[PDB]
Protein backbone atom coordinates (compact mmCIF):
# COMPACT_ATOMS: atom_id res chain seq x y z
CA UNK A 1 0.00 0.00 0.00
CA UNK A 2 1.24 3.48 -1.01
CA UNK A 3 4.18 2.21 -3.07
CA UNK A 4 6.17 5.31 -2.11
CA UNK A 5 6.18 3.99 1.46
CA UNK A 6 7.29 0.60 0.13
CA UNK A 7 10.21 2.28 -1.63
CA UNK A 8 11.04 4.16 1.57
CA UNK A 9 11.08 0.92 3.58
CA UNK A 10 13.26 -0.88 1.03
CA UNK A 11 15.61 2.13 1.04
CA UNK A 12 15.85 1.80 4.83
CA UNK A 13 16.75 -1.87 4.33
CA UNK A 14 19.30 -0.98 1.63
CA UNK A 15 21.04 1.49 3.93
CA UNK A 16 21.01 -1.06 6.75
CA UNK A 17 22.64 -3.68 4.52
CA UNK A 18 25.26 -1.17 3.38
CA UNK A 19 26.12 -0.37 6.99
CA UNK A 20 26.30 -4.12 7.63
CA UNK A 21 28.85 -4.38 4.83
CA UNK A 22 30.89 -1.53 6.28
CA UNK A 23 30.72 -3.16 9.72
CA UNK A 24 32.07 -6.37 8.20
CA UNK A 25 34.82 -4.33 6.55
CA UNK A 26 35.92 -2.64 9.79
CA UNK A 27 35.72 -5.96 11.66
CA UNK A 28 38.00 -7.47 9.01
CA UNK A 29 40.39 -4.51 9.24
CA UNK A 30 40.91 -4.65 13.02
CA UNK A 31 43.56 -7.01 14.36
CA UNK A 32 45.01 -8.40 17.61
CA UNK A 33 42.91 -8.01 20.77
CA UNK A 34 42.03 -4.38 20.07
CA UNK A 35 38.33 -3.63 20.44
CA UNK A 36 36.84 -3.11 16.95
CA UNK A 37 35.55 0.47 16.78
CA UNK A 38 31.79 0.20 16.29
CA UNK A 39 30.37 2.80 18.66
CA UNK A 40 33.09 5.18 17.46
CA UNK A 41 32.29 4.28 13.85
CA UNK A 42 28.54 4.74 14.38
CA UNK A 43 29.05 8.14 16.03
CA UNK A 44 31.42 9.14 13.21
CA UNK A 45 28.79 8.10 10.66
CA UNK A 46 26.10 10.12 12.45
CA UNK A 47 28.36 13.18 12.70
CA UNK A 48 29.23 13.04 9.00
CA UNK A 49 25.55 12.53 8.15
CA UNK A 50 24.57 15.64 10.11
CA UNK A 51 27.35 17.60 8.38
CA UNK A 52 26.07 18.47 4.90
CA UNK A 53 25.38 21.53 2.74
CA UNK A 54 22.82 20.50 0.10
CA UNK A 55 22.60 18.43 -3.11
CA UNK A 56 26.15 17.38 -4.02
CA UNK A 57 27.10 17.22 -0.36
CA UNK A 58 25.59 14.21 1.46
CA UNK A 59 24.46 12.75 -1.85
CA UNK A 60 28.04 12.02 -2.83
CA UNK A 61 28.38 10.72 0.73
CA UNK A 62 25.25 8.56 0.44
CA UNK A 63 26.48 7.01 -2.80
CA UNK A 64 30.00 6.50 -1.43
CA UNK A 65 28.67 4.86 1.73
CA UNK A 66 26.41 2.55 -0.28
CA UNK A 67 29.39 1.57 -2.44
CA UNK A 68 31.49 0.98 0.68
CA UNK A 69 28.73 -1.33 1.90
CA UNK A 70 29.32 -3.61 -1.07
CA UNK A 71 26.94 -6.36 -2.16
CA UNK A 72 23.43 -5.39 -1.07
CA UNK A 73 20.53 -7.62 -2.11
CA UNK A 74 17.66 -5.27 -1.24
CA UNK A 75 19.07 -2.72 -3.67
CA UNK A 76 19.62 -5.53 -6.18
CA UNK A 77 15.93 -6.44 -6.30
CA UNK A 78 14.71 -2.91 -7.06
CA UNK A 79 16.93 -0.83 -9.35
CA UNK A 80 14.79 1.86 -10.96
CA UNK A 81 12.69 2.65 -7.88
CA UNK A 82 15.62 3.30 -5.55
CA UNK A 83 17.64 5.02 -8.28
CA UNK A 84 14.79 7.46 -8.91
CA UNK A 85 14.24 7.91 -5.17
CA UNK A 86 17.90 8.86 -4.70
CA UNK A 87 18.01 11.17 -7.72
CA UNK A 88 14.68 12.76 -6.78
CA UNK A 89 13.30 13.77 -3.34
CA UNK A 90 14.70 16.60 -1.20
CA UNK A 91 18.01 15.55 0.32
CA UNK A 92 16.83 16.39 3.84
CA UNK A 93 14.13 13.70 3.74
CA UNK A 94 16.75 11.23 2.51
CA UNK A 95 18.82 12.28 5.52
CA UNK A 96 15.83 11.59 7.78
CA UNK A 97 15.40 8.14 6.24
CA UNK A 98 19.12 7.37 6.55
CA UNK A 99 19.24 8.41 10.21
CA UNK A 100 16.16 6.30 10.93
CA UNK A 101 18.03 3.46 9.23
CA UNK A 102 20.99 4.12 11.50
CA UNK A 103 18.69 3.40 14.43
CA UNK A 104 16.85 0.60 12.62
CA UNK A 105 19.83 -1.56 11.64
CA UNK A 106 20.36 -2.57 15.25
CA UNK A 107 17.44 -5.03 14.87
CA UNK A 108 19.67 -7.05 12.55
CA UNK A 109 22.22 -7.34 15.38
CA UNK B 1 -32.15 10.14 41.79
CA UNK B 2 -33.46 10.06 38.25
CA UNK B 3 -30.52 8.02 37.02
CA UNK B 4 -30.93 5.72 39.99
CA UNK B 5 -34.55 5.10 39.11
CA UNK B 6 -33.49 4.61 35.51
CA UNK B 7 -30.97 2.14 36.85
CA UNK B 8 -28.32 3.91 34.80
CA UNK B 9 -25.08 5.26 36.24
CA UNK B 10 -25.64 8.26 38.49
CA UNK B 11 -22.71 9.94 36.77
CA UNK B 12 -24.64 10.04 33.51
CA UNK B 13 -23.55 13.61 32.84
CA UNK B 14 -23.23 15.65 36.03
CA UNK B 15 -20.62 18.03 34.62
CA UNK B 16 -22.89 18.84 31.71
CA UNK B 17 -25.60 19.86 34.13
CA UNK B 18 -23.20 21.44 36.63
CA UNK B 19 -21.18 23.55 34.21
CA UNK B 20 -22.09 23.25 30.55
CA UNK B 21 -25.77 23.75 31.24
CA UNK B 22 -25.33 25.50 34.57
CA UNK B 23 -23.35 28.56 33.53
CA UNK B 24 -25.08 30.34 36.40
CA UNK B 25 -23.52 27.74 38.70
CA UNK B 26 -26.84 27.29 40.49
CA UNK B 27 -26.04 23.61 40.97
CA UNK B 28 -22.38 24.13 40.13
CA UNK B 29 -22.15 25.86 43.49
CA UNK B 30 -23.82 22.75 44.84
CA UNK B 31 -21.01 20.94 43.07
CA UNK B 32 -18.62 23.13 45.01
CA UNK B 33 -20.61 22.33 48.14
CA UNK B 34 -20.85 18.65 47.22
CA UNK B 35 -17.78 18.06 45.05
CA UNK B 36 -16.57 15.50 47.55
CA UNK B 37 -19.90 13.73 47.22
CA UNK B 38 -19.49 13.73 43.46
CA UNK B 39 -16.04 12.24 43.87
CA UNK B 40 -17.44 9.71 46.32
CA UNK B 41 -19.90 8.40 43.77
CA UNK B 42 -17.24 8.57 41.08
CA UNK B 43 -15.06 6.47 43.36
CA UNK B 44 -17.88 3.95 43.44
CA UNK B 45 -17.69 4.01 39.66
CA UNK B 46 -15.11 1.44 38.61
CA UNK B 47 -14.88 2.79 35.07
CA UNK B 48 -13.86 6.11 36.59
CA UNK B 49 -10.73 4.39 37.85
CA UNK B 50 -8.69 5.30 34.78
CA UNK B 51 -9.86 8.90 35.01
CA UNK B 52 -9.05 8.88 38.73
CA UNK B 53 -5.50 7.80 37.89
CA UNK B 54 -5.38 10.63 35.34
CA UNK B 55 -6.63 13.00 38.06
CA UNK B 56 -3.74 11.94 40.29
CA UNK B 57 -1.33 12.32 37.36
CA UNK B 58 -2.46 15.88 36.65
CA UNK B 59 -2.37 16.74 40.36
CA UNK B 60 1.23 15.51 40.56
CA UNK B 61 2.13 17.53 37.46
CA UNK B 62 0.63 20.71 38.89
CA UNK B 63 2.40 19.97 42.19
CA UNK B 64 5.66 19.93 40.25
CA UNK B 65 4.79 23.16 38.45
CA UNK B 66 3.92 24.86 41.74
CA UNK B 67 7.22 23.63 43.19
CA UNK B 68 9.01 25.19 40.21
CA UNK B 69 7.18 28.47 40.82
CA UNK B 70 8.06 28.32 44.52
CA UNK B 71 11.71 27.90 43.56
CA UNK B 72 11.37 30.84 41.16
CA UNK B 73 9.65 32.94 43.84
CA UNK B 74 11.88 35.62 45.33
CA UNK B 75 12.33 35.87 49.09
CA UNK B 76 9.72 38.08 50.74
CA UNK B 77 7.51 38.23 47.65
CA UNK B 78 4.22 36.35 47.76
CA UNK B 79 4.04 33.67 45.03
CA UNK B 80 0.94 34.04 42.81
CA UNK B 81 -0.30 30.46 43.13
CA UNK B 82 -3.93 31.61 42.95
CA UNK B 83 -3.09 33.67 39.86
CA UNK B 84 -1.28 30.68 38.35
CA UNK B 85 -4.30 28.44 39.00
CA UNK B 86 -6.58 31.00 37.36
CA UNK B 87 -4.17 31.10 34.42
CA UNK B 88 -4.34 27.30 34.21
CA UNK B 89 -8.14 27.37 34.08
CA UNK B 90 -8.12 30.13 31.46
CA UNK B 91 -5.53 28.37 29.28
CA UNK B 92 -7.39 25.05 29.45
CA UNK B 93 -10.69 26.77 28.59
CA UNK B 94 -8.97 28.54 25.69
CA UNK B 95 -8.05 25.27 23.95
CA UNK B 96 -10.35 24.96 20.96
CA UNK B 97 -9.56 21.61 19.29
CA UNK B 98 -7.95 18.25 19.99
CA UNK B 99 -4.48 19.18 18.73
CA UNK B 100 -3.99 22.38 20.74
CA UNK B 101 -5.42 20.91 23.94
CA UNK B 102 -3.26 17.80 23.66
CA UNK B 103 -0.24 20.01 22.96
CA UNK B 104 -0.88 22.00 26.13
CA UNK B 105 -1.63 18.93 28.25
CA UNK B 106 1.53 17.11 27.14
CA UNK B 107 3.66 20.22 27.63
CA UNK B 108 2.24 20.74 31.13
CA UNK B 109 2.85 17.09 32.01
CA UNK B 110 6.45 17.39 30.81
CA UNK B 111 6.97 20.60 32.80
CA UNK B 112 5.58 18.90 35.91
CA UNK B 113 8.62 16.65 36.14
CA UNK B 114 8.95 13.01 37.19
CA UNK B 115 5.44 11.68 37.87
CA UNK B 116 5.18 8.45 39.86
CA UNK B 117 1.56 7.76 38.90
CA UNK B 118 2.19 8.31 35.19
CA UNK B 119 5.11 5.88 35.48
CA UNK B 120 3.09 3.15 37.21
CA UNK B 121 0.18 3.35 34.75
CA UNK B 122 2.13 4.29 31.62
CA UNK B 123 0.20 2.32 29.00
CA UNK B 124 -3.24 2.92 30.52
CA UNK B 125 -2.83 6.70 30.78
CA UNK B 126 -1.22 6.88 27.33
CA UNK B 127 -4.16 5.02 25.78
CA UNK B 128 -6.63 7.16 27.73
CA UNK B 129 -5.02 10.30 26.32
CA UNK B 130 -4.94 8.86 22.80
CA UNK B 131 -8.55 7.60 22.78
CA UNK B 132 -10.69 9.91 24.90
CA UNK B 133 -12.23 12.95 23.16
CA UNK B 134 -10.30 16.08 24.07
CA UNK B 135 -13.38 17.76 25.56
CA UNK B 136 -13.69 14.98 28.14
CA UNK B 137 -9.99 15.15 29.01
CA UNK B 138 -10.35 18.92 29.43
CA UNK B 139 -13.34 18.37 31.73
CA UNK B 140 -11.45 15.95 33.96
CA UNK B 141 -8.39 18.23 33.95
CA UNK B 142 -10.60 21.07 35.21
CA UNK B 143 -11.97 18.75 37.89
CA UNK B 144 -8.40 17.84 38.87
CA UNK B 145 -7.54 21.53 39.21
CA UNK B 146 -10.67 22.12 41.29
CA UNK B 147 -10.03 19.00 43.41
CA UNK B 148 -6.39 19.83 44.17
CA UNK B 149 -5.82 19.67 47.94
CA UNK B 150 -2.19 19.45 49.22
Amino acid sequence: NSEEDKQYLIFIKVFQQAMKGNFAKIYAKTEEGKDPPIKKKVERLRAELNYCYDELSFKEYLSDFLVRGGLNKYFNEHQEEIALLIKKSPWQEIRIWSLLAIASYKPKD
Amino acid sequence: ADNLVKGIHWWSNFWEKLVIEDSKEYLFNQLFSNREGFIIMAENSEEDKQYLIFIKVFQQAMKGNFAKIYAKTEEGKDPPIKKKVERLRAELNYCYDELSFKEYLSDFLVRGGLNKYFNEHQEEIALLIKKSPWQEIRIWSLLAIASYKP
Binding site: - | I20, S23, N93, Y94, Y96, D97
Partner: protein, 285 residues
Protein backbone atom coordinates in the same frame (compact mmCIF):
# COMPACT_ATOMS: atom_id res chain seq x y z
CA UNK C 1 -53.00 23.59 -10.84
CA UNK C 2 -50.63 23.36 -7.85
CA UNK C 3 -47.15 24.70 -8.62
CA UNK C 4 -44.36 24.89 -6.05
CA UNK C 5 -40.78 26.16 -6.08
CA UNK C 6 -37.98 24.34 -4.25
CA UNK C 7 -34.29 25.13 -4.18
CA UNK C 8 -31.01 24.43 -2.44
CA UNK C 9 -28.60 27.37 -2.42
CA UNK C 10 -24.86 27.53 -1.81
CA UNK C 11 -23.01 30.66 -0.72
CA UNK C 12 -19.50 31.91 -1.41
CA UNK C 13 -16.46 31.07 0.69
CA UNK C 14 -15.57 33.31 3.60
CA UNK C 15 -15.25 33.68 7.35
CA UNK C 16 -18.63 33.59 9.08
CA UNK C 17 -19.80 34.00 12.68
CA UNK C 18 -23.45 34.67 11.89
CA UNK C 19 -25.25 32.55 14.48
CA UNK C 20 -23.70 32.99 17.93
CA UNK C 21 -25.67 30.90 20.40
CA UNK C 22 -25.86 31.47 24.16
CA UNK C 23 -22.26 32.33 25.02
CA UNK C 24 -20.29 30.72 27.84
CA UNK C 25 -17.69 32.53 29.95
CA UNK C 26 -15.60 34.77 27.71
CA UNK C 27 -16.00 32.90 24.40
CA UNK C 28 -18.92 33.66 22.08
CA UNK C 29 -19.82 30.23 20.73
CA UNK C 30 -21.45 30.17 17.30
CA UNK C 31 -24.24 27.62 17.09
CA UNK C 32 -23.21 24.22 15.78
CA UNK C 33 -24.49 20.66 15.57
CA UNK C 34 -23.98 17.31 13.93
CA UNK C 35 -24.52 16.59 10.24
CA UNK C 36 -23.29 14.18 7.52
CA UNK C 37 -20.58 11.72 8.65
CA UNK C 38 -21.05 12.70 12.30
CA UNK C 39 -18.82 15.77 12.10
CA UNK C 40 -19.92 19.00 13.77
CA UNK C 41 -21.15 21.68 11.37
CA UNK C 42 -22.06 25.31 11.99
CA UNK C 43 -25.70 26.26 11.43
CA UNK C 44 -27.26 29.59 10.50
CA UNK C 45 -30.92 29.63 11.40
CA UNK C 46 -33.72 29.91 8.88
CA UNK C 47 -35.34 32.72 10.89
CA UNK C 48 -32.31 34.85 10.00
CA UNK C 49 -32.88 34.38 6.27
CA UNK C 50 -36.60 35.03 6.74
CA UNK C 51 -35.70 38.30 8.48
CA UNK C 52 -33.34 39.11 5.61
CA UNK C 53 -36.12 38.54 3.08
CA UNK C 54 -38.44 40.73 5.16
CA UNK C 55 -35.79 43.46 5.16
CA UNK C 56 -35.34 43.13 1.39
CA UNK C 57 -39.08 43.51 0.84
CA UNK C 58 -39.10 46.54 3.15
CA UNK C 59 -36.16 48.17 1.36
CA UNK C 60 -37.39 47.59 -2.20
CA UNK C 61 -40.52 49.61 -1.43
CA UNK C 62 -43.18 46.94 -1.02
CA UNK C 63 -45.87 47.34 1.64
CA UNK C 64 -44.57 45.04 4.41
CA UNK C 65 -46.67 45.09 7.58
CA UNK C 66 -43.62 44.94 9.87
CA UNK C 67 -41.41 48.01 9.50
CA UNK C 68 -37.88 47.73 10.90
CA UNK C 69 -36.58 51.07 12.19
CA UNK C 70 -32.86 50.78 11.50
CA UNK C 71 -31.88 53.71 13.72
CA UNK C 72 -34.12 52.66 16.62
CA UNK C 73 -33.33 48.94 16.08
CA UNK C 74 -37.02 48.33 16.79
CA UNK C 75 -39.88 46.66 14.92
CA UNK C 76 -43.19 48.46 14.42
CA UNK C 77 -46.53 47.32 13.00
CA UNK C 78 -48.22 49.45 10.35
CA UNK C 79 -51.60 47.94 11.28
CA UNK C 80 -52.52 45.81 14.29
CA UNK C 81 -54.70 43.57 12.10
CA UNK C 82 -52.80 41.34 9.70
CA UNK C 83 -54.07 41.66 6.11
CA UNK C 84 -52.38 39.10 3.84
CA UNK C 85 -54.26 40.56 0.86
CA UNK C 86 -52.44 43.89 1.19
CA UNK C 87 -49.13 43.16 2.96
CA UNK C 88 -46.37 41.15 1.29
CA UNK C 89 -44.79 39.88 4.52
CA UNK C 90 -48.15 38.80 5.92
CA UNK C 91 -48.88 37.08 2.60
CA UNK C 92 -45.57 35.19 2.43
CA UNK C 93 -44.09 34.65 5.89
CA UNK C 94 -47.42 34.29 7.71
CA UNK C 95 -48.35 35.58 11.15
CA UNK C 96 -49.64 34.53 14.58
CA UNK C 97 -50.80 37.26 16.97
CA UNK C 98 -52.19 35.12 19.83
CA UNK C 99 -58.49 35.83 11.04
CA UNK C 100 -55.63 35.14 13.48
CA UNK C 101 -52.98 33.04 11.73
CA UNK C 102 -51.74 32.13 8.25
CA UNK C 103 -49.87 29.03 7.11
CA UNK C 104 -47.25 31.03 5.21
CA UNK C 105 -46.11 30.32 1.66
CA UNK C 106 -42.35 30.45 2.26
CA UNK C 107 -41.02 27.38 4.03
CA UNK C 108 -37.28 27.56 4.69
CA UNK C 109 -34.84 25.24 6.44
CA UNK C 110 -31.61 25.96 8.30
CA UNK C 111 -28.34 27.02 6.67
CA UNK C 112 -25.77 24.27 7.23
CA UNK C 113 -22.03 24.60 6.72
CA UNK C 114 -20.74 22.55 3.79
CA UNK C 115 -17.42 21.97 5.60
CA UNK C 116 -17.20 20.54 9.14
CA UNK C 117 -16.30 22.97 11.92
CA UNK C 118 -12.80 22.39 13.27
CA UNK C 119 -13.10 24.81 16.18
CA UNK C 120 -11.20 27.90 15.05
CA UNK C 121 -11.48 30.82 17.47
CA UNK C 122 -10.44 34.48 17.40
CA UNK C 123 -9.26 36.61 20.32
CA UNK C 124 -10.42 40.21 20.66
CA UNK C 125 -9.25 42.63 23.32
CA UNK C 126 -9.99 46.25 24.19
CA UNK C 127 -7.01 48.50 23.50
CA UNK C 128 -5.21 50.63 26.04
CA UNK C 129 -3.35 49.91 29.26
CA UNK C 130 -6.55 50.56 31.26
CA UNK C 131 -7.94 47.01 31.31
CA UNK C 132 -11.20 45.93 32.94
CA UNK C 133 -13.36 42.79 33.07
CA UNK C 134 -14.54 43.51 29.51
CA UNK C 135 -10.97 43.85 28.21
CA UNK C 136 -10.39 40.64 26.22
CA UNK C 137 -12.81 38.20 24.61
CA UNK C 138 -12.89 35.25 22.22
CA UNK C 139 -15.14 35.03 19.17
CA UNK C 140 -15.66 31.75 17.32
CA UNK C 141 -15.63 31.89 13.52
CA UNK C 142 -15.90 29.48 10.61
CA UNK C 143 -14.54 29.63 7.05
CA UNK C 144 -17.21 27.80 5.06
CA UNK C 145 -19.76 27.92 2.29
CA UNK C 146 -23.28 27.86 3.73
CA UNK C 147 -26.16 25.87 2.25
CA UNK C 148 -29.86 26.17 3.05
CA UNK C 149 -33.05 24.66 1.65
CA UNK C 150 -36.31 26.50 1.03
CA UNK C 151 -39.71 25.66 -0.40
CA UNK C 152 -42.61 27.91 -1.37
CA UNK C 153 -46.17 27.21 -2.53
CA UNK C 154 -47.13 29.39 -5.50
CA UNK C 155 -50.83 28.57 -5.18
CA UNK C 156 -50.88 29.45 -1.47
CA UNK C 157 -49.87 33.06 -2.21
CA UNK C 158 -52.84 35.40 -1.97
CA UNK C 159 -51.38 37.35 -4.91
CA UNK C 160 -49.49 35.15 -7.36
CA UNK C 161 -47.33 38.05 -8.55
CA UNK C 162 -45.63 38.11 -5.13
CA UNK C 163 -43.40 35.17 -6.12
CA UNK C 164 -41.23 37.43 -8.29
CA UNK C 165 -39.99 39.77 -5.50
CA UNK C 166 -39.19 36.79 -3.27
CA UNK C 167 -37.01 35.25 -5.99
CA UNK C 168 -35.33 38.61 -6.57
CA UNK C 169 -34.69 38.86 -2.84
CA UNK C 170 -33.21 35.37 -2.65
CA UNK C 171 -30.84 36.22 -5.50
CA UNK C 172 -30.13 39.61 -3.90
CA UNK C 173 -30.31 38.64 -0.24
CA UNK C 174 -29.32 41.49 2.11
CA UNK C 175 -27.13 40.89 5.16
CA UNK C 176 -28.02 37.79 7.15
CA UNK C 177 -27.97 38.45 10.89
CA UNK C 178 -24.44 38.04 12.19
CA UNK C 179 -21.34 40.03 13.19
CA UNK C 180 -20.66 42.26 10.18
CA UNK C 181 -18.09 44.39 12.03
CA UNK C 182 -15.44 41.68 12.25
CA UNK C 183 -16.92 38.85 10.11
CA UNK C 184 -18.75 40.39 7.14
CA UNK C 185 -19.98 37.28 5.36
CA UNK C 186 -21.92 37.87 2.12
CA UNK C 187 -24.86 35.47 1.80
CA UNK C 188 -25.39 36.14 -1.91
CA UNK C 189 -25.99 32.92 -3.88
CA UNK C 190 -23.28 31.56 -6.14
CA UNK C 191 -24.77 28.16 -7.09
CA UNK C 192 -28.47 27.24 -7.28
CA UNK C 193 -30.45 24.05 -7.79
CA UNK C 194 -34.06 25.08 -8.43
CA UNK C 195 -37.08 22.87 -9.09
CA UNK C 196 -40.41 24.24 -10.38
CA UNK C 197 -42.89 21.36 -10.58
CA UNK C 198 -46.56 20.56 -10.02
CA UNK C 199 -45.85 17.44 -7.96
CA UNK C 200 -44.61 18.11 -4.46
CA UNK C 201 -41.88 15.46 -4.20
CA UNK C 202 -38.51 17.19 -3.89
CA UNK C 203 -35.13 15.52 -4.31
CA UNK C 204 -32.83 18.56 -4.28
CA UNK C 205 -32.62 19.12 -0.51
CA UNK C 206 -28.96 19.61 0.45
CA UNK C 207 -27.56 18.34 -2.85
CA UNK C 208 -24.08 19.80 -2.27
CA UNK C 209 -20.99 18.04 -0.92
CA UNK C 210 -17.34 18.87 -0.31
CA UNK C 211 -14.48 17.29 -2.24
CA UNK C 212 -12.07 17.55 0.71
CA UNK C 213 -12.93 18.04 4.40
CA UNK C 214 -11.10 21.41 4.50
CA UNK C 215 -11.42 23.08 1.10
CA UNK C 216 -13.47 25.46 -1.03
CA UNK C 217 -14.47 23.04 -3.80
CA UNK C 218 -18.26 22.61 -3.53
CA UNK C 219 -19.00 19.77 -5.93
CA UNK C 220 -22.48 18.42 -6.62
CA UNK C 221 -23.53 15.47 -4.48
CA UNK C 222 -23.44 11.98 -5.96
CA UNK C 223 -26.99 11.19 -4.81
CA UNK C 224 -28.56 14.08 -6.75
CA UNK C 225 -26.74 13.25 -10.00
CA UNK C 226 -27.50 9.54 -9.60
CA UNK C 227 -31.19 10.26 -8.99
CA UNK C 228 -31.30 12.43 -12.11
CA UNK C 229 -29.70 9.51 -13.97
CA UNK C 230 -32.14 6.91 -12.66
CA UNK C 231 -35.26 8.50 -14.14
CA UNK C 232 -37.08 10.63 -11.57
CA UNK C 233 -36.74 14.41 -11.06
CA UNK C 234 -37.41 15.42 -14.65
CA UNK C 235 -34.55 17.46 -16.19
CA UNK C 236 -37.10 19.75 -17.86
CA UNK C 237 -38.14 20.90 -14.36
CA UNK C 238 -34.54 21.23 -13.12
CA UNK C 239 -32.79 24.60 -12.85
CA UNK C 240 -29.08 24.63 -11.98
CA UNK C 241 -26.93 27.75 -12.14
CA UNK C 242 -23.79 29.18 -10.64
CA UNK C 243 -20.24 28.02 -10.09
CA UNK C 244 -21.27 24.35 -10.07
CA UNK C 245 -22.10 24.70 -13.78
CA UNK C 246 -18.39 24.66 -14.63
CA UNK C 247 -17.79 21.48 -12.63
CA UNK C 248 -20.82 19.83 -14.22
CA UNK C 249 -19.60 20.77 -17.71
CA UNK C 250 -16.12 19.38 -16.93
CA UNK C 251 -17.59 15.99 -15.99
CA UNK C 252 -17.03 13.06 -18.32
CA UNK C 253 -19.82 11.86 -20.65
CA UNK C 254 -21.80 15.00 -19.74
CA UNK C 255 -23.23 15.32 -23.27
CA UNK C 256 -24.89 11.90 -22.85
CA UNK C 257 -26.13 12.12 -19.26
CA UNK C 258 -29.68 13.35 -18.53
CA UNK C 259 -28.03 16.35 -16.84
CA UNK C 260 -27.37 17.66 -20.36
CA UNK C 261 -31.07 18.25 -21.13
CA UNK C 262 -31.66 20.25 -17.94
CA UNK C 263 -31.74 24.03 -17.60
CA UNK C 264 -28.13 24.93 -16.80
CA UNK C 265 -26.75 28.46 -17.00
CA UNK C 266 -23.30 29.72 -16.03
CA UNK C 267 -24.67 33.20 -15.34
CA UNK C 268 -27.17 33.13 -12.49
CA UNK C 269 -29.07 36.16 -13.78
CA UNK C 270 -29.88 34.42 -17.08
CA UNK C 271 -31.18 31.30 -15.31
CA UNK C 272 -33.26 33.50 -13.00
CA UNK C 273 -34.70 35.38 -15.97
CA UNK C 274 -35.61 32.11 -17.70
CA UNK C 275 -37.20 30.66 -14.55
CA UNK C 276 -39.15 33.89 -13.98
CA UNK C 277 -40.42 33.81 -17.57
CA UNK C 278 -41.50 30.19 -17.08
CA UNK C 279 -43.27 31.03 -13.81
CA UNK C 280 -45.05 34.04 -15.32
CA UNK C 281 -46.19 31.88 -18.24
CA UNK C 282 -47.39 29.10 -15.93
CA UNK C 283 -49.30 31.29 -13.47
CA UNK C 284 -50.78 33.71 -16.01
CA UNK C 285 -48.82 36.78 -14.93
Amino acid sequence: PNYYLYGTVLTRYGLASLNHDIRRGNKTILQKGYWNNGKIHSFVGSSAIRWALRFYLQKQGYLVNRVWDEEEHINRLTSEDFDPEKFYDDDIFGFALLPNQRMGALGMNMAVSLTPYDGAVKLGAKSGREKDSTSLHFTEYHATRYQYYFGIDATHLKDFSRILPMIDGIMNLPKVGGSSNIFNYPFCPDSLVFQWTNHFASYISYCFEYCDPKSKEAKLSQEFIDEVECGQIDPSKLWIGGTIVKDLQQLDNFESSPLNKAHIYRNRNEMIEALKTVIKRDLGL
